Design a protein around this ligand. Structure first.
Ligand SMILES: Nc1ncnc2c1ncn2[C@@H]1O[C@@H]2COP(=O)(O)O[C@H]3[C@@H](O)[C@H](n4ccc(=O)[nH]c4=O)O[C@@H]3COP(=O)(O)O[C@H]2[C@H]1O
Ligand SMILES: Nc1ncnc2c1ncn2[C@@H]1O[C@@H]2COP(=O)(O)O[C@H]3[C@@H](O)[C@H](n4ccc(=O)[nH]c4=O)O[C@@H]3COP(=O)(O)O[C@H]2[C@H]1O
Ligand SMILES: Nc1ncnc2c1ncn2[C@@H]1O[C@@H]2COP(=O)(O)O[C@H]3[C@@H](O)[C@H](n4ccc(=O)[nH]c4=O)O[C@@H]3COP(=O)(O)O[C@H]2[C@H]1O
Ligand SMILES: Nc1ncnc2c1ncn2[C@@H]1O[C@@H]2COP(=O)(O)O[C@H]3[C@@H](O)[C@H](n4ccc(=O)[nH]c4=O)O[C@@H]3COP(=O)(O)O[C@H]2[C@H]1O
Lengths: 297, 302, 303, 301
């Protein structure tokens, strides 16, 4: 609506597998209440694994309408690959068709993509502005001089199913990355650290609209431990956020479903089930409609 | 006693956070032995908060009760190595259960002389469980606050030292009769430094210019399937990412970290070490790491 | 063309010492890169003295000749890998001579833009042979002082990098005519921090207060009859470690910063004679990350 | 026999002994001529003495209060017995019977002067310098136990543990720490640069009020591509350290007593055990004191 109001609204998108059709429904009930593309009422856009695709397109062009078509055309196909190498090939073509040649300079709003380094074991975060980092200024090239087609492709590669990406920075050093779900499945906490410390904002200035994908049921003792350890981090990171930044206006939109006919597998290639998740989630906004307009205006 | 220096009260709040790594805690004793003598009094008279983790809780508790370093080292070398020599996973729990009953016989969380906190991980909820000591350190729900959940200070430690693939799972019953399930605290936070500042910043409100953090680890050593490597790889990512977040958020706080990295094939251990001569080498390695930074630690705490 | 900022004169005298490694010099190229862009000017505009051992001698010379860091990195990966690829003592010596011919051929110890010192060990006298630039850096015999023994830089740096077991001893002919035989400068001082300290206290008599010391190493990495072998390895480590312990006893009240980290994981097992550019590329990333921790402190030293 | 008193001036006088093995006899010949010039035990004039692997057995006996005439009696009887044993294991064993019969259960509290003994840490690769007073320490003055609560029979035996011909030794300090040490002739063979530091940063003194006396064993002739290097690098450390000394500490009046011999009538052997050969080394020491008596009289008086 208006131009500026000294209110920094951040957007943290979760993401994983085909279940990202949920947040496409939530984000569909929005951008109509507003009337403008979702980047016209936001200053930061964070996305870890599947919200990274939604993060880019929102940041460099088209609205949700188009995104949905680009998401139902290529994404349901890549999961339908019975080999780990085949999934990596279709993902490369996906990243090559929706992102042809645009890079981190053609981005319209502040964006941060989450990725994990396989050797240093600490997250890599692609940023797009000079005053966005906290240290080591100088030799700071937006997006490491990398193309967006290769930045998102790395941030979507789950190791046990995909292949580990190898990116060639502009400075000439090959980095071996994996998807940003292994370090932060929820970029909410990281998003607070940019507006607070880097952008130098007060503690009552920001409105954090966090959108998720939802919780769903299921269709060697190390395999159980992987699922258990990969859930403690996301929960503990959430609890930590509530203790540190308890005085920040936040709204989390991610509901839990318990019906047996709703259990997914994070890789469901069924257009006759992803459509239902797109529907259940258009109602999850209908319960907080009166509250979200206090944040977006 | 031979430690009689009385330090006057001041407005500065000095925090101490102890890392845990198992039987490799001898590195922590060697470092703390030098810090006490530099002061001249037991550590409970100069520090205002103490947190710990799996093996650091056995040390973090004794510092809060009032024990001196020379007494802590007298017990840490006869009970800790003997439980790591247990073969069966059921034997490592029967042996750890006898440890806390000979060091923390009957005391509770109401007989501590400083701020305390012990980290433990829930299994069902998958969130931390920190055993506070005073209601002033809580972050809500203060109307039903009981120091230490009404749990004895011996069981709060037995739960934090129990790693799942090697120990058993601990079941405690609090005051209100709630059978909670817990495992080692090295899953949610291996370095409680980020948990320690959070408890001393929004609770016990202190500015960023009046806090002195001192993090003492256990060191870094070389190594002595597909789903198994992934497991170890995920754990390192969480630890190396949790402290970087601390560096971004909390960088205006004077902080000193005392840990050392070794690369020789002789200094190769794991968290199952029970060799007396090997552990002794780790002890005198920590004392050397203090002298390199003594010129600065004297400025923080005189 | 990019670095344009200027820094005025001042009384505090800085110093820079570079450890002598091998193919592991890529680690130092990362640390120096971050420091360069941070300052915003070539290093010969802020530092007032630079020492260097075998591998740091190439960098210590190029830094003293006006070259930037983005130019040294090009001249480093272009030739050094060939030097390490050879599998013979005479072959490595020939490549080392071809290297020292193209990077600088017609240059002597009189085009240096700052004060320089290059460490090299004699084979007969068993005392160091430190090539200096000006006469004020000398301690004795100030009646016959040619700035650099009359020797050119092409073979002055070639003598420093002559590890006798894998290379051949270098024979130098000075201006007076003395035929001297030298070996790697890493046999007498693998860390020239102490030597540079002594050259800025007894000569160029600055008090301990106003001396800012910066020592950039190469990092410690794991290793991938046998009695005299180990015992030779231990003797080389004893001299290196004992010399550092002697340093912080006398010159304890001098501000200093040492940037050299340690790694222990098996994927990093870098040793001497490394020629795989893939592993050598990873080390340049580590040195770039090692500066990120001490960036707040180094800003107090260099301003 | 030895009756002479000297006033307590403001000048410190250091004595640094080197190490060469059985060649210590050369040092005794020089000390016999210095004491006789003063007419008093050496501890009443000197304030600090360091040693390394040969001077330990001598610097220890000096700081206790012995006289040179009594040291030579023990040195001539027990030292050549050590080197006579031809085995890497028998030399380390016989070296115990040397310290167990001389320093019979003594500590670093029974000293009348500042002492310092040098050794080498096998695992850490740094020096271990035993001392006997807290005012000679550089930091970590807390938890300072004189001599690490170790006896003198073991601190001396460690500084004479030359790995090629001797075995390693293990040392248990006061705080149950098991350290592994070797000979001290690997980190510093001439303890001149160590003593000057221990008397400048600790025992703060001006370079105008110090007088160092360094005595060695002399340089004598010698009677695979991997051994050559080892013998070369050991003497590149000895050298380049004397040079570092001459550059840093130049305004400190000093005297060195070590003469070079070239004839083939010598036999460089730290493992020497021929009495007629060692008696000659003892004579060259006295012959060397005569050329520098005029100056030693100016320093010691
Ligand atoms: N909000 C946050 N919350 C928690 N942690 C955060 C947050 N933001 C960053 N980090 C972590 O901070 C670490 C170091 O950040 P620095 O600011 O010190 O320097 C940056 C920058 O100068 C430069 N650079 C950055 C982006 C770009 O597009 N091109 C580019 O060149 O590289 C360094 C990136 O390194 P990593 O990305 O691998 O690691 C990061 C990250 O893990
Ligand atoms: N410094 C920290 N760093 C990182 N995480 C932290 C920190 N502090 C708390 N948390 C997490 O936040 C959750 C809620 O904490 P609260 O302080 O808001 O409420 C507390 C308190 O009221 C009461 N209580 C606490 C301690 C005690 O000895 N007796 C007692 O009665 O019980 C609740 C504790 O329950 P958990 O401990 O199981 O859950 C905690 C923890 O997961
Ligand atoms: N900072 C130091 N740290 C550690 N050791 C050092 C240091 N400086 C000198 N030494 C050692 O001390 C010995 C004598 O040094 P001097 O300075 O007293 O005399 C110098 C000078 O007058 C002249 N000369 C020097 C350099 C030059 O480029 N042209 C030139 O003409 O030759 C003599 C050099 O000979 P070496 O170099 O072979 O021997 C040196 C070295 O072994
Ligand atoms: N003049 C010198 N020149 C060059 N280097 C020197 C010099 N003096 C010491 N060092 C080196 O400096 C390192 C650290 O010494 P520190 O002074 O810091 O603290 C001492 C002291 O507090 C305590 N202690 C000492 C003597 C004793 O009889 N009982 C006792 O308890 O133990 C530490 C001994 O350690 P090491 O001996 O193993 O190593 C030493 C040494 O290698």
């Amino acid at each position: 609506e208006y131009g500026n109001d000294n209110i920094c609204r951040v957007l943290a998108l979760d993401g994983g597998g085909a279940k990202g059709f949920y947040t496409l429904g939530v984000l569909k009930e929005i951008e109509a209440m507003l009337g403008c593309p979702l980047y016209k009422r936001f200053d930061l856009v964070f996305g870890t694994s599947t919200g990274a695709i939604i993060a880019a397109l929102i940041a460099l062009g088209y609205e949700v309408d188009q995104i949905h078509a680009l998401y139902t055309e290529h994404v349901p196909r890549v999961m339908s690959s019975r080999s780990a190498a085949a999934r990596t090939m279709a993902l490369q073509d996906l990243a090559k068709e929706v992102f042809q040649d645009k890079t981190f300079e053609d981005v319209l709003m502040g964006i941060g993509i989450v990725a994990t380094r396989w050797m240093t074991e600490r997250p890599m975060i692609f940023k797009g502005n000079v005053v966005q980092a906290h240290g080591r200024k100088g030799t700071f090239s937006p997006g490491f001089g990398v193309s967006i087609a290769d930045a998102v492709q790395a941030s979507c590669s789950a190791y046990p199913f995909f292949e580990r990406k190898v990116i060639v920075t502009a400075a000439g050093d090959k980095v071996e990355l994996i998807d940003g779900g292994y370090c932060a499945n929820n970029p909410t906490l990281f998003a607070i650290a940019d507006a607070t410390v880097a952008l130098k904002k007060d503690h009552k200035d920001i409105r954090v609209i966090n959108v998720g994908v939802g919780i769903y049921p299921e269709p060697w003792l190390a395999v159980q431990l992987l699922q258990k350890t990969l859930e403690i981090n996301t929960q503990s990171m959430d609890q930590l956020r509530d203790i540190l930044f308890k005085d920040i206006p936040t709204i989390r939109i991610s509901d839990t479903f318990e019906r047996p006919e709703m259990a997914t597998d994070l890789l469901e290639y069924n257009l006759d089930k992803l459509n239902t998740l797109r529907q259940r989630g258009r109602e999850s906004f209908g319960a907080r409609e009166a509250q979200l307009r206090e944040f977006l205006i």
